[PDB]
């Protein structure tokens, strides 16, 4: 028995075209261009999920450094001081405290300074 | 000689920005009230400068 191409070809390509909605020009229209872009989008997303973790860690440190400098301490010493104190608040939580509650951050700084 | 790459719809349409025709320089004819080209005889009533042409 003969099997004609049928509807499977259209159904599959349409899914790819829908995945490339919002892309520029032909990239949101034609199957070949969108497929390539959707492939690139996957590879990028995979890479960027890992990169996101590196970026947010970087931001938290930057904000902590600024907060520490206001208390006349370097980030490097503050974190070394916190470790000696035995304080295990992570950089994200430290950054949030520095922004939200200055008085609480000041207390943590004193603990770090005392440990040194 | 020949296009290295095809022109996208975007590029083509940007080029066509100034590809347009203006409205005719027309004013209402005083005698009949139909629009006529300025400095031309009114086609409807065949009058120019308040005189039949």
């Amino acid at each position: 028995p003969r099997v004609k191409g049928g509807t499977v070809t259209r159904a599959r390509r349409k899914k790819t075209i829908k995945l490339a909605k919002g892309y520029f020009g032909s990239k949101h229209t034609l199957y070949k261009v969108a497929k390539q872009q959707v492939m690139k989008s996957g590879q990028y997303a995979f890479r960027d999920r890992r990169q996101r973790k590196r970026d947010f860690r970087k931001l938290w440190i930057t904000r902590i450094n600024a907060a520490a400098r206001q208390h006349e301490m370097s980030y490097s010493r503050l974190m070394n001081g916190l470790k000696k104190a035995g304080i295990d608040i992570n950089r994200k939580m430290l950054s949030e405290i520095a922004i939200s509650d200055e008085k609480a951050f000041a207390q943590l700084v004193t603990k770090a300074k005392d440990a040194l | 000689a020949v296009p290295k790459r095809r022109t996208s719809k975007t590029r083509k349409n940007k080029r066509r920005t100034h590809f347009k025709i203006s409205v005719p320089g027309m004013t209402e004819c005083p005698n009949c009230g139909e629009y006529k080209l300025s400095h031309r005889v009114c086609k409807n009533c065949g009058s120019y400068n308040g005189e039949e042409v």
């Binding site: 947010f56 931001l59 206001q70 922004i99 | -």
Partner: protein
């Protein structure tokens, strides 16, 4: 859980500072100003917004160099015309256009992005000790 604060124009507050360039090395002053302009000294620092403060530099004419930079440090500019290379020494630039010397030094320490260009526009440099931004009520800043 995602809990990181994000600064936005609604919550951002930009201050005005005056820094005296008298008796300061160009680069060391420059690097410090660049951080202030980019909001690096703020706990609310956010990369995709401008959290930095406006900086006024005065007495740019009195900025200092080390070694033989005055004669041996040369700025090169091209006009995009063949053989269109033009050079003036750092010392001559200090004499003629001290504000440019400071401005170019700091801008070279700022990112080449739309945001970075915007942050550079917040810098105001003056060769003399007098500035015209009294209305901004700027605060003196001492370099660390």
């Amino acid at each position: 859980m995602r809990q990181t604060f994000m600064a936005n124009e609604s919550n951002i507050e930009r201050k005005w500072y005056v820094i005296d360039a008298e008796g300061q090395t160009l680069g060391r002053l420059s690097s410090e100003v660049a951080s202030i302009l980019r909001g690096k000294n703020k706990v609310t620092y956010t990369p995709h917004v401008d959290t930095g403060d406006y900086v006024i530099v005065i007495n740019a004419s009195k900025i200092e160099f080390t070694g033989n930079k005055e004669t041996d440090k040369v700025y090169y500019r091209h006009s995009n015309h063949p053989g269109g290379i033009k050079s003036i020494t750092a010392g001559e630039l200090r004499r003629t256009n001290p504000e440019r010397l400071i401005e170019n030094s700091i801008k070279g320490m700022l990112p080449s992005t739309r945001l970075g260009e915007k942050q550079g526009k917040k810098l105001f440099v003056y060769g003399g000790a007098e500035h015209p931004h009294a209305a901004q009520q700027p605060e003196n800043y001492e370099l660390r």
